[PDB]
């Protein structure tokens, strides 16, 4: 007979693009606005396909591109209502602080009466301000941008979130134990709703990320090319925890009607330089395993060296810890660390910056209010960002350096196995059935 | 690793005939036009794709690991140095004097 027939609900899909909405698991306003995100299911379905093969290139994935877009918008939205610190940067007369880590000085600011003005003192870090020339300074960014205070109530701490597809679409993830970004993978499972993806922010060391399994996964757009970064993924995480011992104080200085901002008020106790601690023996073995994995992709001896240079954002390790922003040297880990064929730690002295140019797009900056009391944060290192020197046809050396080439690579580590796709439940198969 | 080779290193041909130069290498390749003391100018990229502005006479062919550069209908001001440029290695170019 060979009569056409229409089958509804058949397994056919093709590459497709769409918008994914937020979902969260489980009182105080959050920058991510997780209250808006719908609750996640108690037990997401993890159906696994039996015998099928598919290939995808994560570098062309748009899930990461959308994540960067909406995360950028979310930060902008949270800062719309609360005050902007535009008037603050005037001629500042600063000499030194009684307690060049921190500088103490004052400025003239408006009061309840607009015509009248008052003199108020405040504390700023040395790198926060810049010298006009003697003894006079201005905020690092007022002749090229406008600084806005971050709303004190919101908390910037990352909370796991689910990028969860809508109805009629599916997300394919394959659990190949060893598999880089590109290439086919034969064990692919369909998950409607993705798993936890913490929006951690860092520049040199990836922290609070999912660990690898069975291998030290290494991913990069092209190994031969030098511009593209190289992402490491460690199966055994390294515990890094550190605290700033200094005790701060909160002070309020005011510039307009109902508009108040918080500046560093005073230092309590003896001034002590903050630092961070890492294990000696554990970290060294971590790099040895990484060096071995890198060797087979180049067939040359692997060497490490510090960052070449640049602005403080990349040349120093940065992260979020209890509402404070850090910029640390992380140079002892990548100095003279050429690899051959105890109860001691690594000290990484560093300091804190208030005015931050995060989300490096022209136009605006941010200010992080200070908080009284010390901060403690313990994090686990999972993956590294590296950039090959690329010094031509080198004899046997391929010296490596750290540095985050682009911020988008922070989330590409956790999205290397994911792909949105549209499903068409219609088909026209051959059958002998024919309607009366 | 990246490998480069420019076998001829020198070529002298008449005007109006068909002339070409040979470069062998692995990876993306580009061709440039360098005069005496002037900045190089890009002729064709991605092996065979043409650039906007350069005359259509310049052309090339991608064959496996062998890269051609077809030059036909010569005019004056087209006599300058040619070299093939992979990401980081650039061997000395070849001259098309006459």
């Amino acid at each position, epitope marked *: 007979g060979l009569w056409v027939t229409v089958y509804y609900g058949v397994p056919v899909w093709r590459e497709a693009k769409t918008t994914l909405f937020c979902a969260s698991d489980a009182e105080v306003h959050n920058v991510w606005a997780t209250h808006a995100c719908v609750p996640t299911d108690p037990n997401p379905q993890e159906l696994v396909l039996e015998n099928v093969t598919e290939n995808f290139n994560m570098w062309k994935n748009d899930m990461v591109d959308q994540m960067h877009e909406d995360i950028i918008s979310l930060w902008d939205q949270s800062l719309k209502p609360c005050v902007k610190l535009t008037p603050l940067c005037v001629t500042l007369n600063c000499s030194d602080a009684k307690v060049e880590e921190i500088k103490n000085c004052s400025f003239k600011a408006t009061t309840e009466l607009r015509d009248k003005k008052r003199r108020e003192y405040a504390l700023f870090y040395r790198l926060d301000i810049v010298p006009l020339s003697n003894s006079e300074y201005r905020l690092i960014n007022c002749n090229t941008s406008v600084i806005t205070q971050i709303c004190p109530k919101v908390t910037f701490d990352p909370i796991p979130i689910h990028y969860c597809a809508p109805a009629g679409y599916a997300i394919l993830k394959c659990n190949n134990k060893t598999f880089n970004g590109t290439g086919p993978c034969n064990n692919v499972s369909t998950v409607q709703c993705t798993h936890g993806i913490k929006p951690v922010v860092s520049t040199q060391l990836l922290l609070n990320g999912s660990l690898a399994e069975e291998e030290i996964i290494i991913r990069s757009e092209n190994l031969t090319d030098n511009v593209k970064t190289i992402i490491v993924h460690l199966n055994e995480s390294v515990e890094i925890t550190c605290t700033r011992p200094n005790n701060m104080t909160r002070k309020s200085v005011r510039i307009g009607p109902g508009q108040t901002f918080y500046a560093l008020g005073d230092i309590i106790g003896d001034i002590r330089q903050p630092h961070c601690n890492i294990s000696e023996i554990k970290w060294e073995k971590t790099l040895q395993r990484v060096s071995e994995k890198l060797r087979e992709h180049f067939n040359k001896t692997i060497i490490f060296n510090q960052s070449s240079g640049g602005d403080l954002e990349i040349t120093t390790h940065s992260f979020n810890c209890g509402g404070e922003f850090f910029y640390c040297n992380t140079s002892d880990l990548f100095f003279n660390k050429t690899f051959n064929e105890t109860n001691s730690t690594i000290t990484l002295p560093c300091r804190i910056k208030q005015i931050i140019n995060m989300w490096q797009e022209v136009g605006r900056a941010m200010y992080a209010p200070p908080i009284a009391g010390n901060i403690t944060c313990k994090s686990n290192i999972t993956g590294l960002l590296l950039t090959r020197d690329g010094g031509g046809n080198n004899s046997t050396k391929e010296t490596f350096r750290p540095g985050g080439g682009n911020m988008r690579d922070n989330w590409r580590s956790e999205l290397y196995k994911y792909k949105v796709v549209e499903v068409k439940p219609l088909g026209i198969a051959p059958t002998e059935c024919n309607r009366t | 690793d990246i490998q480069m080779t420019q076998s001829p290193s020198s070529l002298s041909a008449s005007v109006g005939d068909t002339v070409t130069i040979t470069c062998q290498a692995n990876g993306y390749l580009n061709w440039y036009q360098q005069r005496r003391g002037k900045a190089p100018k890009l002729l064709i990229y991605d092996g065979s794709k043409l650039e906007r502005g350069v005359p259509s006479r310049f052309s090339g062919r991608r064959w496996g690991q062998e890269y051609n550069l077809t030059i036909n209908n010569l005019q004056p001001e087209d006599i300058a140095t040619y070299f093939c440029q*992979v990401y980081e290695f*650039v061997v000395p170019g070849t001259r098309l004097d006459l």
Partner: nanobody
Amino acid sequence: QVQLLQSGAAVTKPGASVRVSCEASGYNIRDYFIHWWRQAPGQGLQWVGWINPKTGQPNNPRQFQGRVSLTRHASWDFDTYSFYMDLKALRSDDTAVYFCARQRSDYWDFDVWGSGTQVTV
């Protein structure tokens, strides 16, 4: 409209330092890399490195490693970025001409080049 300015040729005694300035104003500088090349007499081009306009992270071969330093400095407005190049020690064989290029579209193709600066030792 897209063009690059260049500093004038200068000559310095051995052991001194030299400064070469490149400017880009005809496009969105932050979206394209900048690369530096050296053209010594008697041989072909020699690579120097690149500087990312978004963040001044250099990348240089071992031959010039530790001496050449690439720095960027935007103007008052985010246009007409100026790219510099400083090296500490000059050898007797450093005489060459330094160019200023641009990378785009994932391909090491340089459609814009600087006039070049000739420096002796």
